[PDB]
Structures are given as C-alpha cells and as structure tokens.
Design an enzyme around this catalytic site. Structure first.
Site, PDB file in Angstrom:
ATOM      1  N   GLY A  28       0.879  -1.168   0.000  1.00  0.00           N
ATOM      2  CA  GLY A  28       0.000   0.000   0.000  1.00  0.00           C
ATOM      3  C   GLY A  28       0.903   1.201   0.000  1.00  0.00           C
ATOM      4  O   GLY A  28       2.045   1.126   0.475  1.00  0.00           O
ATOM      5  N   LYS A  29       0.414   2.305  -0.546  1.00  0.00           N
ATOM      6  CA  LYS A  29       1.202   3.521  -0.602  1.00  0.00           C
ATOM      7  C   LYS A  29       0.209   4.695  -0.539  1.00  0.00           C
ATOM      8  O   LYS A  29      -0.991   4.445  -0.561  1.00  0.00           O
ATOM      9  CB  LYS A  29       2.070   3.487  -1.878  1.00  0.00           C
ATOM     10  N   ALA A  84       2.261   7.823   3.946  1.00  0.00           N
ATOM     11  CA  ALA A  84       2.037   6.494   4.579  1.00  0.00           C
ATOM     12  C   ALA A  84       2.121   5.240   3.658  1.00  0.00           C
ATOM     13  O   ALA A  84       1.289   5.078   2.763  1.00  0.00           O
ATOM     14  CB  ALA A  84       0.696   6.487   5.381  1.00  0.00           C
ATOM     15  N   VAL A 133       2.451   0.779   3.470  1.00  0.00           N
ATOM     16  CA  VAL A 133       2.167  -0.384   4.253  1.00  0.00           C
ATOM     17  C   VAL A 133       2.993  -1.532   3.696  1.00  0.00           C
ATOM     18  O   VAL A 133       2.833  -1.932   2.547  1.00  0.00           O
ATOM     19  CB  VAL A 133       0.662  -0.689   4.289  1.00  0.00           C
ATOM     20  N   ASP A 162     -16.543   6.448  10.610  1.00  0.00           N
ATOM     21  CA  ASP A 162     -16.407   6.392   9.131  1.00  0.00           C
ATOM     22  C   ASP A 162     -16.155   4.966   8.635  1.00  0.00           C
ATOM     23  O   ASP A 162     -15.017   4.567   8.397  1.00  0.00           O
ATOM     24  CB  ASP A 162     -15.356   7.419   8.601  1.00  0.00           C
TER      25      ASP A 162
END
Lengths: 296, 293
Positions: free
Chosen positions: A13-14, A16, A18, A126
């Site tokens: 993930g991109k 931040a 992961v 949320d």
C-alpha cells in the site's frame, strides 16, 4: 530491510506506506504501517494519535490486532495483524452478491466488532467496504465514503454519536447482500437527495427478514435508531444460531504469565522481568510485540 | 460506424480513440451500453447529450456525431490528447500564477458560456478538465468541489454552484492542493462550512483577492462570472484584452469548399443544409464538421 525485529518484504500500500514483513524472532507475518509524520498536517497528526490510542485498546478477533509501535521523531511505525484475504469490496466485485447465509456470517462479526467499539465509547465514525478486510479464513477484520454517510451529514446536523455507525452498518448490510449501494447517483446532489429521502431499492431475491433488519439500521432520524445491542437481538441476525444469539462481545481477561511463551522468550534473551513490565505497562514495545506474536 | 476504432482509452461505458475514415481525423468515441443503464443514468445521458449538441466553445469538447441504436449509444467527440489537468498538477507540481491564469481564463470563459445558455454544469472537478495538444483547456472525486449549500441540505441548483467550484479549481491550480481537505467527510464538511482555507506563502494578494470573490459562503452573495471576468488577477497580462463573455460565432452551414467535397462523397446539398440547420449530428453533420480542420 530492518526496523525493530522485522524483515521487510513487499510493499502492499502507498499514499504512509504499508509493508508486509516477517518478525525475525517468531517468523510470523505482519503488516507494518510506515508513516512519515513530517509530512502530516496538524489534524492528520491528531487523527493518527487518536487511531493509536484506540489501536492499543481494542482486542476483538475481528478488529486487526496491534502488535508494536515504534516511535521516532520523524517516522512512526505501526506493527499490526495482516489480513491476507484483502477487502470485502474486492470479494463482492469478484463473486457478486453474498447469499444471505454468508452475509450473515460476515455481518455478525461486523456488528459485534463495532458494538465492542461502542462499549468502550469509541465510535468508528467512518465505516466503508474499503475498511472491511478478510483473513485467511474469510473472517472479517476491521482496519469511497459518501454512500456510507448518515443523513445528518447533509443537514449540517451534529455528526458525533454511535448512531452514525448504525446507519453505516445498514449500508454495509445492503451492499453485502445486494452487491450494490442502497443510495447512489453519478454526483453528490443526487446522492444527497437519495440519502435524505432514505428510500432504497428492494432486490426481488431479498428475504423479508433481511429487509426488516435493514429498516432497523437505516432510520432517517438519528435519535430514533436502535443500539447495536438491541439490533443484536434481531431475527435475521440470528437465523442459523438458534442457541448462541449475538450478545455483546466480552473480552477475555489478560494473561501476561503464559509459561509457554515466557520460556520461549527467555531463550531469546528476554527477561521475565521486562516481559512483565512491558505487558502490565501495555508498552507495545519489542517485548510486548513478541509475546503477543507468539500467541499464534 | 464510419470510424476505424484504434486504442481503447477508458472503461467503466467505454471510450475508444478512433479515426474518421473519410477525413482521417482523430476522434474519441464514447460507446455506451444503454441496456445496463438504470433509469436516472439514462436521464442524465439524455441531458448530457442535449447539452453536448449545443455548446460550441473552443474549451469545451466539441460533439461531432451521435449514432443511436436500440442498445448502444455512441458519442463522437473531440479528443483531448493532453490528458487531465489533475495529472499535470501531480506531474509538474503547482502552476506559476501566469500559467494558472492562462488555463483559468479559458475555464471561466467556458463555464460562463455555459451559463449564457442557462446550463449549469453543477459538478466541476479537475478530472473534468483536460488538455489538448497545446495545453488548452477542454472541459468534458467530487466532494472537495462541493459548495456549502450541499451540506446545509439547502437547494443545490443555480449557477452560483459553479462559481464556488471555480474557486476551488483556482486554488488547486496555483497551490497544487485542495482548499478544503480532510481524511473523511465529517472533516471536509466542517471545513467547507467554516469556509476558511490555507493561504500559501507564495500566493499573490491579487490571487487571494480573486479567491475571495469565488469562495463566498452565502450563495446569493456570489459574483456572476461576467463580473468576476472583470477582476484584476484575471486580467494581469491582458491589459488590452480584458476577458469578456465569449460570443458564439455565427452559423456557417454553406462553406462551398466543404460542400463540394461532400457532394462527390455522394451527399446532396439538400441534406447537408437540413442536417446542419436541424443540428442533427448525423453522419452528414459529423462529416461537414470534421472537414473543418
């Protein structure tokens, strides 16, 4: 590719980052959020610290467990349980709608998890299908957002309480059994017009129970909304569980003295001493991380 | 139909980049399967088509042809070979104010034109803003552009909607970021509703002053684009050349150059006029237009 006791493996993930990674000492796979704090505006930093407070405290088999927090001045790392089965969205796009039996299984987990949040006066505020993940075993793990929003967002009402999550949960149920969102449109003004009136298409295959349960979540008026404890008593929720009705989750009492894991750690060179301190102190350090990770 | 389909270039309705066989011109064709469109998608598709037929501005993409079948609608249109303005922001960082201005005068012109014809685009984004070969604007996700009245459950219908949006577009053109952000809609709403936004240190006071004319919380207190057209920032570098509402050029359905060519192609003077006056956007109309380059 080392931080703490972790061999970094693929990014996943991109935006931040992961990274998926191996805890050197236990060989367990985990996901590491890498967060550049130097890039975060004030209220992002707020939401990060909050998230972290919450992470530390939730201990439910369908919320992703946090394992370690490594803080440096610039970069914060969050070491956490990795859901290999990816998003629930994906799975719907993939196999279409869920049969009611399956939606129910996933959904019990979902309502349980969020109810647990509520017991601790935490509101997720949320929810989305992008937040619902899957493990190896097709269990939910809780970790874009317009069609999930409660009416009160579009009336400029206060948008603070648990009943926000309740509406959300309605939308999630609906998506889970229909494969689509109950309120859509190609733009915000349609979307809002639809959310505000609150009517939604009933698919012909939908059982009447299912629709009855939807009506308990998707009630326009916030203060007229069930608690999750009440909803937890619903018929559709319980079909196939005539003996173990969904009751609020009770988390089990801590056990910082597991001899199996303590011995293994002592070999690793940890002291019984720190092991205790870190656990009692809920430090989330390398010592806590390890102990928790050996729990698997 | 009359077109060689080449590269696909969108799906989700498909868009295929294609060449008009008779003129060899590059066009984009939106192919739409109507059989999968629910009711209000269908209403919107029909509306977008009404509008497409009528707007003739150099920074809105031209419609060239509409081919209707029972199942499938195709829309033949101008192809913006420069991609999204977003992409370009993400690519090159923010725009210097001079460049922002050049793009932005085209945008304001475009949308103002829209309003002259009582159309409100109602939903502007940077995903809606494309570029051609020569980095000119061609107008074709959405929450940070939404006006305050969306979150006040107030009515969301008029051109002042577009005026707010334009503000946001101005701001992201020169800062490379949105004026009202947040990682969720509760945040985004609180921000939009307060109405205040970060002023980057490099921003000119003129720029900021123009922002002020757009991003005015109260709907009925908002400039028209005609008035805003008169603002200083809009006109820096154009002291001879104050922006004014675009005037449509006059219908030219009889250009003899093109009419001759189309006669040999086997078209009758007759239909050529009918198709044009009648704004039929049939193959004859398509061809006449496409011969215009």
């Amino acid at each position: 590719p080392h931080i703490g006791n972790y061999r970094l493996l693929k990014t996943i993930g991109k935006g931040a980052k992961v990274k998926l990674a191996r805890h050197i000492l236990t060989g367990k796979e985990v996901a590491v959020k890498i967060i550049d704090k130097t890039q975060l505006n004030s209220s992002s930093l707020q939401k990060l610290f909050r998230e972290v407070r919450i992470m530390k405290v939730l201990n439910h088999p369908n919320i992703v467990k946090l394992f370690e927090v490594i803080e440096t001045e610039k970069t914060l790392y969050l070491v956490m349980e990795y859901a290999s089965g990816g998003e629930v969205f994906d799975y719907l796009v993939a196999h279409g709608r869920m049969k009611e039996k399956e939606a129910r299984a996933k959904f019990r987990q979902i309502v349980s998890a969020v109810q647990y949040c509520h017991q601790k006066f935490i509101v997720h505020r949320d929810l989305k299908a992008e937040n619902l993940l899957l493990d190896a075993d097709m269990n939910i793990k809780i970790a874009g957002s317009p069609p999930y929003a409660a009416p009160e967002l579009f009336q400029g009402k206060k948008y603070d309480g648990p009943e926000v999550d309740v509406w959300s949960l309605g939308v999630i149920l609906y998506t889970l059994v229909s494969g689509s969102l109950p309120f859509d449109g190609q733009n915000l003004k349609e979307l809002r017009e639809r959310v505000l009136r609150g009517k939604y298409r009933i698919p012909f295959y939908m059982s009447t129970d299912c629709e009855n349960l939807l009506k308990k979540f998707l009630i326009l008026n916030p203060s007229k909304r069930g608690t999750l404890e009440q909803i937890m008593k619903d018929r559709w929720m319980n079909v196939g569980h005539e003996d173990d009705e969904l009751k609020p989750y009770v988390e089990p009492l801590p056990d910082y003295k597991d001899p199996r894991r303590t011995e293994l750690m002592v070999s690793m060179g940890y002291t019984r001493e720190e092991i205790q301190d870190s656990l009692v102190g809920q430090r989330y350090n390398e010592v806590m991380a390890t102990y928790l990770l050996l729990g698997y």
